[PDB]
Amino acid sequence: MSNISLIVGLGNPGSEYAQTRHNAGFWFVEQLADKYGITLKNDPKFHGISGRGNIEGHDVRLLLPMTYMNRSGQSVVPFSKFYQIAPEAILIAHDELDMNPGVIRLKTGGGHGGHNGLRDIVPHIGPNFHRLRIGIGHPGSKERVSGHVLGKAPSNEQSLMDGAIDHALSKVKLLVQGQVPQAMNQINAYKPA
Amino acid sequence: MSNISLIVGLGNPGSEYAQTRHNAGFWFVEQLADKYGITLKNDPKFHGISGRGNIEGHDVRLLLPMTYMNRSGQSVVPFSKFYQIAPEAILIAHDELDMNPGVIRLKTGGGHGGHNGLRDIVPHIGPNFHRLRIGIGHPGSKERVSGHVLGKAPSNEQSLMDGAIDHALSKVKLLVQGQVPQAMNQINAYKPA
Known part of the structure; x- marks a missing residue:
């Protein structure tokens, strides 16, 4: 429904990418999975790692594509189709160049904004899914x-991102219960302490 | 048999990786293809870009996997199987952490040396293929x-690597004509300074 029933984290597979800024969506979803004791398992049918469990009284699926970033729709699309999950019930967490470390926002609809993981998803399921935009800063030229995206942040910037992610994790209850406008207000108001 | 009939360049797809050190193998094979007027075309059956043509009087095939580095065997293995190309007729060009920029060597056999592209190939075709090890330098810790590998080299280092690659290109005639020990001697004698 209005309820978010699928939470996708974007990123690249492997230890060589795990601490890079482009993996901010993986960070969020890994942390969410373990907060609720949901196991992420290899899911080769859908070219990803996935899990399912109870989050705050709702049955939610979690997905990390293992396709590499720019091919994320090869996982998200057939997975959401197989489980008959509408875009309106999907939240996709991703790194956002257009927001600074420590800034985090929930957005509904719109385009990819030059993010090449979203670019691989929007054509197939349309734009009307929700996004958790995790700021990583923009380095100032193309x-x-x-x-920048394939680099590890310095520790001060990593702490800002981690704090923002921690805050969003605390608002997942609102999202899985279908209270999206309230989640947006509460997520988007975050500022580092 | 001895004559090299397939030359593979390892790397990652896309403009975001094209200038990175881990793409040194793509550099070599792209440059070789254009030196001989051999077109590299999309080859989705083998998850790569490939070409075929005359190099110094021999029919040689060129392959760039588009699998991402750590899945290179998903291209190399079926390609070599379909064309029935034995390992001893394969040259794989790749970046080498354990050699400095400007150093370049031809090696036959051995293991992957912690290179995650070769790690994906050796288990399937065995170790007895030839390697063009293009030095990229080591940043000093794991x-x-x-x-380092997902970064662009500064211009002084890039010059050193480019000169080494140019030298190897000059020795391809020996390789495709089945004079591998002479190619080895002449490639491995290159001095960047």
Whole structure:
């Protein structure tokens, strides 16, 4: 329904990418899975790692595509189709160049904004899914973007991102209960302490 | 048999990776293809970009896996099987952490040496293929490796690597004509300084 029933985290597989900024969505979903004791298991049928369990009284599926970032729709699309999950019930967590570390926002609809993981998803399921935009900062020119997203943040910036993620994790109850406008207000108001 | 009939370049797809050190193998094979006027075309059956043509009077095939580095065997293995190309007729060009920029060597056999592209190939075709090891330098600790290989080299290091690659290109005639020990001697004698 209005309830969020699928939470997707975008990122690249493997230890070589695990601490990079482009994996912010993985960070969120890994942390959410363990907060609720939901096991993420290899799911080769859908080219990902997935799990399912109770979050705050609702049965929620969790998915990390293992396709690499730019091919994320190869996992998200057939997975959501197989389970008959509408876009309106999907939340996709991702790194956002257009927001600073420590800034986090929930958005509904719109485009990819040059994010090449979203670019692989929007064509197939349309734009009307929810996004948890986890700020990672913009390095100030197009040529610097690759090394920024495929780079590890320094610890001060990582703490800002982690705090923002911690805050959003605390609002997942609102999302899985279908209180999206309230979740948006409460997530989007976050500022680092 | 001895004559090299397949030359593979390892790397990651997409403009965000094209200038990164881990793509040194793509550099070599792209440059080789254009030197001989061999078109590299999309080859989705083998999850790669491939071409075929005349190099110094021999029919040689060129392959760039589009699987991402750590899944290179998903391209190399079925390709070599379909064309019935034995390992001893394969040259795989790749970045080498354990050699400095400007150093370049031809090696036959051995293991992956912790290179995660070769790690995906050796289990399936065995170790008895030839390797063009293109030095990229080592950043000095395991945790710094990812940012190094997924980073663009500064111009002084890029010059050194480019000169080494140019030298190897000049020796391809020996390889495709089945003079591998002579190619080895002449490639491995290259001095960047």
